[PDB]
Amino acid sequence: GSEEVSEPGDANIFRVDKDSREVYMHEKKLDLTRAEYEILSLLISKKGYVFSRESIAIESESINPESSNKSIDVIIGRLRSKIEKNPKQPQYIISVRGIGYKLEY
Numbered sequence: 001g002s003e004e005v006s007e008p009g010d011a012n013i014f015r016v017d018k019d020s021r022e023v024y025m026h027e028k029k030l031d032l033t034r035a036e037y038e039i040l041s042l043l044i045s046k047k048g049y050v051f052s053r054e055s056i057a058i059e060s061e062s063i064n065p066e067s068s069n070k071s072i073d074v075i076i077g078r079l080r081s082k083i084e085k086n087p088k089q090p091q092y093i094i095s096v097r098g099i100g101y102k103l104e105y
Protein backbone atom coordinates (compact mmCIF):
# COMPACT_ATOMS: atom_id res chain seq x y z
CA GLY A 1 0.00 0.00 0.00
CA SER A 2 1.03 3.65 -0.72
CA GLU A 3 -0.37 7.23 -1.12
CA GLU A 4 -1.56 8.98 -4.34
CA VAL A 5 0.58 11.56 -6.32
CA SER A 6 -2.28 14.16 -6.08
CA GLU A 7 -3.90 13.91 -2.58
CA PRO A 8 -6.82 16.27 -1.60
CA GLY A 9 -6.70 18.89 1.22
CA ASP A 10 -9.28 20.73 3.40
CA ALA A 11 -10.21 23.54 5.84
CA ASN A 12 -13.21 23.69 8.27
CA ILE A 13 -16.45 23.71 6.09
CA PHE A 14 -14.79 23.03 2.66
CA ARG A 15 -12.29 20.71 0.85
CA VAL A 16 -10.00 20.97 -2.25
CA ASP A 17 -9.57 18.10 -4.76
CA LYS A 18 -6.29 18.48 -6.74
CA ASP A 19 -6.81 15.60 -9.28
CA SER A 20 -10.12 16.81 -10.79
CA ARG A 21 -9.32 20.48 -9.73
CA GLU A 22 -12.55 21.02 -7.69
CA VAL A 23 -13.93 22.35 -4.29
CA TYR A 24 -16.40 20.47 -2.00
CA MET A 25 -18.60 22.39 0.51
CA HIS A 26 -20.39 20.66 3.45
CA GLU A 27 -23.67 21.15 1.42
CA LYS A 28 -22.42 20.42 -2.16
CA LYS A 29 -19.69 19.68 -4.79
CA LEU A 30 -18.48 22.67 -6.94
CA ASP A 31 -16.10 22.43 -9.86
CA LEU A 32 -15.08 25.43 -12.04
CA THR A 33 -11.26 26.07 -12.29
CA ARG A 34 -8.47 26.89 -9.77
CA ALA A 35 -9.22 30.65 -9.63
CA GLU A 36 -13.02 30.14 -9.09
CA TYR A 37 -12.14 27.55 -6.46
CA GLU A 38 -9.82 30.18 -4.83
CA ILE A 39 -12.73 32.70 -4.58
CA LEU A 40 -15.33 30.23 -3.24
CA SER A 41 -12.74 28.75 -0.80
CA LEU A 42 -12.08 32.31 0.51
CA LEU A 43 -15.89 32.98 0.54
CA ILE A 44 -16.56 30.09 2.98
CA SER A 45 -13.37 31.01 4.92
CA LYS A 46 -14.71 34.62 5.52
CA LYS A 47 -18.57 34.20 5.23
CA GLY A 48 -21.28 33.62 2.53
CA TYR A 49 -22.18 37.35 2.17
CA VAL A 50 -23.10 38.65 -1.31
CA PHE A 51 -20.59 37.19 -3.80
CA SER A 52 -20.02 40.14 -6.19
CA ARG A 53 -18.16 41.07 -9.47
CA GLU A 54 -15.62 43.38 -7.65
CA SER A 55 -14.97 41.01 -4.67
CA ILE A 56 -14.72 38.14 -7.24
CA ALA A 57 -12.11 40.19 -9.21
CA ILE A 58 -10.21 40.77 -5.92
CA GLU A 59 -10.05 37.02 -4.97
CA SER A 60 -9.80 35.14 -8.40
CA GLU A 61 -7.98 38.05 -10.14
CA SER A 62 -6.64 36.10 -13.24
CA ILE A 63 -9.09 38.32 -15.28
CA ASN A 64 -8.04 41.51 -17.21
CA PRO A 65 -11.06 43.89 -16.51
CA GLU A 66 -11.26 44.61 -12.72
CA SER A 67 -15.02 45.39 -13.13
CA SER A 68 -15.39 41.59 -13.78
CA ASN A 69 -18.66 41.71 -15.85
CA LYS A 70 -17.38 38.71 -17.94
CA SER A 71 -15.86 36.78 -14.97
CA ILE A 72 -19.20 36.84 -13.04
CA ASP A 73 -20.98 35.80 -16.28
CA VAL A 74 -18.54 32.83 -16.78
CA ILE A 75 -18.71 31.94 -13.04
CA ILE A 76 -22.57 32.03 -12.80
CA GLY A 77 -22.82 30.22 -16.19
CA ARG A 78 -20.38 27.39 -15.30
CA LEU A 79 -21.72 27.06 -11.68
CA ARG A 80 -25.26 26.65 -13.16
CA SER A 81 -23.94 24.22 -15.82
CA LYS A 82 -22.15 21.98 -13.26
CA ILE A 83 -25.15 21.94 -10.79
CA GLU A 84 -27.64 21.31 -13.68
CA LYS A 85 -25.59 18.44 -15.29
CA ASN A 86 -24.77 16.78 -11.90
CA PRO A 87 -27.73 15.85 -9.54
CA LYS A 88 -26.21 18.02 -6.72
CA GLN A 89 -27.99 21.47 -6.65
CA PRO A 90 -27.93 24.61 -4.35
CA GLN A 91 -30.46 25.67 -1.70
CA TYR A 92 -28.57 28.32 0.42
CA ILE A 93 -27.25 30.27 -2.65
CA ILE A 94 -29.70 32.98 -3.99
CA SER A 95 -29.19 35.13 -7.17
CA VAL A 96 -29.27 38.98 -6.63
CA ARG A 97 -29.75 40.78 -10.01
CA GLY A 98 -26.45 42.46 -11.22
CA ILE A 99 -25.21 42.98 -7.58
CA GLY A 100 -24.15 39.29 -7.29
CA TYR A 101 -25.31 36.13 -5.48
CA LYS A 102 -26.08 35.77 -1.74
CA LEU A 103 -24.98 32.88 0.54
CA GLU A 104 -24.96 32.24 4.33
CA TYR A 105 -22.88 29.96 6.64
